[PDB]
Amino acid sequence: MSFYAALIDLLGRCAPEMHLIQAGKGEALRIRAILRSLVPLDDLVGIIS
Amino acid sequence: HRTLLYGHAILLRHAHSRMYLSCLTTSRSMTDKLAFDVGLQEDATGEAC
């Protein structure tokens, strides 16, 4: 699980920026959507819990 | 007529339905979490088609 924690950290650091998201850059929105599809929210909530 | 070559974007229109082939965001296949269903959409807007 250190492997998966490091992978999650790498994905989070690879996630786009809030100003780009607000400006609506298509590539940034696509990257955030891809990361969203790869990692579900429920898994994060449960492993936090 | 434009000759089709690799690394080019194309648009496919169903003959009978006059709709456009696209990649839907719904995933009915529970076997794969990353899988996405492909279907028809009635609008040419966006990059999904």
Taking the C-alpha atoms of residue A15 and residue A31, their distance in angstroms, rounded to an integer, is 7
Residues in chain A: 49
Q: What is the DSSP string of B5-29?
A: -SS-----B-TTT--EEEE-S----
Q: How was this structure determined?
A: cryo-EM
Q: Which of B37, B32, B49 is nearest to A38 (CA)?
A: B32
Which of B46, B2, B4, B3 shows the shortest CA–CA distance to B25? B46
Nearest to B36 by CA among B48, B45, B46, B24: B24
- Contacts (Cβ under 8 Å, ≥6 apart) of A22: none
Query: Residue B48 CB: number of other CB atoms within 10 A?
Result: 14
Widest CA span in chain B: 41
Angstrom resolution of this structure: 3.2
Dihedral angle sign, alpha carbons of residues B39, B40, B43, B45: positive
Chain breaks in chain A (C to N over 2.5 A) after: none
Query: Measured between CB atoms, does A2 come within 8 Å of chain B?
Result: no
Is the Cβ of A37 closer than 8 Å to some Cβ of chain B?
A: yes
